[model samples]
Target chain A: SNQGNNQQNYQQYSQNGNQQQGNNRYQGYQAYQNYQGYS
Target chain B: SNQGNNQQNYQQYSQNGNQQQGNNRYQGYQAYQNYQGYS
Candidate 1:
């Protein structure tokens, strides 16, 4: 008599993506400061 | 006798990713335009 045993394996995968935006509000204010210098 | 003809199919995929930057140079100039009003 003969007996056989079998085993199975599993795999897992994960991923993530992120994006960013730009801010320019303070940049405009800096120019205002430069204009005051001419006065 | 038997004759058999087999045809295979193919698949194709394409993707594109594009990102943009901010333009704040003119925004600063606009602030200068406002200061002129004070003069």
Candidate 2:
């Protein structure tokens, strides 16, 4: 019944992903594996 | 070594390049997990 849960997760992820990418600490492949469950 | 570090974890996982390419928006799983952990 909580519709906003996934939305907020997406938002938080997007925000951090941007910051981490800028810092060159982001591994897109690792992230892709982890998030496949969500899809 | 600080017992455990996220950067090291990232580096270890970054080697999975087979599925890592061309998928940049995969951080949502981590964000969702983090959210649930906080909850």
Candidate 3:
């Protein structure tokens, strides 16, 4: 379907820099730094 | 250390709803439905 075709792709991430556990769905930009050492 | 301590917390997502690729990090609740069939 063209549902996600017109949607702008955002940055994605995984589970704790690991290739396992938790899923990675595209969403709004979650860019953050110096936020309690959670970057 | 209390690096990640006292954090208000937030929701996370993945790339194409899969349990692989992209990492998952604590961010603002990205709860959304009917968003171009992207849930």
- Candidate 1, pairs of clashing residues: none
- Chain B, TM-score, each prediction? 0.22, 0.13, 0.19
Instruction: Return the interface RMSD of the candidates, in order shown, one decimal each.
Output: 26.9, 18.2, 21.3
2 against 3, candidate with superior TM-score? 3
Q: Model 1 segments beyond 4 Å from truth? A: A1-39, B1-3, B16-39
Ranking by DockQ: 3, 1, 2
Q: On residues A1-39, what C-alpha lDDT tens digit does candidate 1 reach at each position?
A: 113333333222211212113344544444442222221
Best-fitting candidate, scored by lDDT: 3
Candidate 2 lDDT: 0.26
Q: Looking at model 1 chain B, report the run of 10 residues with the lowest lDDT sum.
A: B11-20
- What is the number of backbone collisions in each predicted candidate, taken in the order shown? 0, 1, 12
* Chain A TM-score compared with the true chain A, each model in order: 0.22, 0.11, 0.19
Q: For candidate 3, lDDT tens digit of each residue in A1-39?
A: 332223223344433333343455554544431111222
Superior candidate under lDDT, 2 versus 3: 3
Overall lDDT per candidate, in order of appearance = 0.29, 0.26, 0.37
Residue A33 displacement (Å), model 3: 39
Go through the candidates in order and give each one's DockQ: 0.06, 0.05, 0.06
lDDT of 2 by residue, B6-31 (tens): 22122112221222212344432453
